């Protein structure tokens, strides 16, 4: 009736996916044994959306995952639910990553992505029907950007009438193993802006900025970082995986949120900023704990309350609270802003109060929405590009395999078009 696949990638996308399904099975508890731990027996359809049929009421994901560094996945296979996966995900080798964008983009990945497309093709039809693709994809490594871009391309020529869910980690000046990542960014979203349906500007140095400064956490590690981002995107996709009365479907989300179908970079924030470490243990009521919904300095993107131009919002609650206070809070935060009074955006009243039982909390407060601060994120990406490229530095690492300069030139033409269009929107 409604099925979503499980394709992952990268060396960081795979581990954030491991944490993702760990924390979204935290409220499900689906055992890997076969004792049939039912979360809710009326939710056979809403376990079948993600955990698909393999036996009699044994529901497992469409578990296929690929990378050339097997140590990370062999480490995360010994997790809480790290063994409830089909013996078909193990499609890989030992060629190495090396933070090489060309080998994931052009040379090494072209001999291995055929097996991945074959297994997703032979796994897609083994259900009622196909509805959605999803991917936890990263840019911190080298291979992941290239093979994710080529996989999105191949699913464009192979499955055009299907949505794909593309998580995308933005580069970071604060945590970085190698620094070539401006080149890993300027020719990754060069075609991703016209290849996929919806994307995410989950940042990394704004994310570390809110992890360090505005939370005062003594854990600058990938552990609590993955905990926070997995909780945030779990609160995001809880709406899509639990359709109570609202939280419209896949193309329906693309219908009401995407004008000018390149401007599909919505920024997922989260209100209470609960974190393993310093914790606040009161029942989160609506107004004074959903007051962290509108503040632009409290999300996974570098923004500004006055230097910001929103044109869509979304809020999917989880507690059994009322909606009058939600509506008056929305009225205040939507009538307060002078720059928000533009000729566009007549109606974005989509807000959910669905009774979904959470993992450690009892409610939630999620933000999903576009802005023009993604333009200044791409502006600092562009200034890193000018720091790295204006003397053609470090291009000998990558030009030997299959690349040249004119792909970068058309990428910069697309960046100039994006900057010009978003500046036109800012002064419209």
């Amino acid at each position: 009736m409604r099925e979503i696949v499980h394709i992952q990638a990268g060396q960081c996308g795979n581990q954030i996916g491991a944490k993702f399904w760990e924390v979204i099975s935290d409220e499900h508890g689906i055992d890997p044994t076969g004792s049939y731990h039912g979360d809710s027996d009326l939710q056979l359809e809403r376990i079948n959306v993600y955990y698909n049929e393999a036996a009699g009421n044994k529901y497992v994901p469409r578990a296929i995952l690929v990378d050339l560094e097997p140590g990370t996945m062999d480490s995360v296979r010994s997790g809480p639910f790290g063994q409830i996966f089909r013996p078909d995900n193990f499609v890989f080798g030992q060629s190495g990553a090396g933070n090489n964008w060309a080998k994931g983009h052009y040379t090494e990945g072209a001999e291995l992505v055929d097996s991945v497309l074959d297994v997703v093709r032979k796994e897609s039809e083994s259900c009622d029907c196909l509805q959605g693709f999803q991917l936890t994809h990263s840019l911190g490594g080298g291979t992941g950007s290239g093979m994710g871009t080529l996989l999105i391309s191949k699913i464009r020529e192979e499955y055009p009438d299907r949505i794909m869910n593309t998580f995308s980690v933005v580069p970071s000046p604060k945590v970085s193993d190698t620094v070539v990542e401006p080149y890993n960014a300027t020719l990754s979203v060069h075609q991703l802006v016209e290849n996929t349906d919806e994307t995410y500007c989950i940042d990394n140095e704004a994310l570390y900025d809110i992890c360090f400064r505005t939370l005062k956490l003594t854990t600058p590690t990938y552990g609590d970082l993955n905990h926070l981002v997995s909780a945030t995107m779990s609160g995001v996709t809880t709406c899509l995986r639990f359709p109570g009365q609202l939280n419209a479907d896949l193309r329906k989300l693309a219908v009401n949120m995407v004008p000018f179908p390149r401007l599909h970079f919505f920024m997922p924030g989260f209100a209470p900023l609960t974190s393993r470490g310093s914790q606040q243990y009161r029942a989160l009521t609506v107004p004074e704990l959903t007051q962290q919904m509108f503040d632009a300095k409290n999300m996974m993107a570098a923004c500004d309350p006055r230097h910001g131009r929103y044109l869509t919002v979304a809020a999917v609650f989880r507690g059994r609270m009322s909606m009058k206070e939600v509506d008056e809070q929305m009225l205040n935060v939507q009538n307060k802003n002078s720059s928000y009074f533009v000729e566009w955006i007549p109606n974005n009243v989509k807000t959910a109060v669905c009774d979904i039982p959470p993992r450690g909390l009892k409610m939630s407060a999620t933000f999903i929405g576009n802005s023009t601060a993604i333009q200044e994120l791409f502006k600092r990406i562009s200034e890193q590009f000018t720091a790295m490229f204006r003397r053609k530095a470090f291009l000998h690492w990558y030009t030997g395999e299959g690349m040249d300069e004119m792909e970068f030139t058309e990428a910069e033409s697309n960046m100039n078009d994006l900057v010009s269009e978003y500046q036109q929107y800012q002064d419209a």
Partner: protein, 55 residues
């Protein structure tokens, strides 16, 4: 076929020289990079047409 192979090289020379190398930005250096890689692939096709045809 030898006179064919010399008169075509003559027509790769003749009909299209490099366009006027003056464009109103630094993008004319970019299109001169296009044309030097274009002469690189003319090198390519000219070593095809003598070695994979008469060799």
């Amino acid at each position: 076929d030898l006179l064919k192979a010399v008169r075509l090289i003559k027509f790769l020379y003749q009909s299209n020289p490099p366009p006027n190398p003056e464009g109103t930005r630094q993008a004319r250096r970019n299109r001169r990079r296009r044309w030097r890689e274009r002469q690189r692939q003319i090198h390519s096709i000219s070593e095809r047409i003598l070695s994979t045809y008469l060799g």
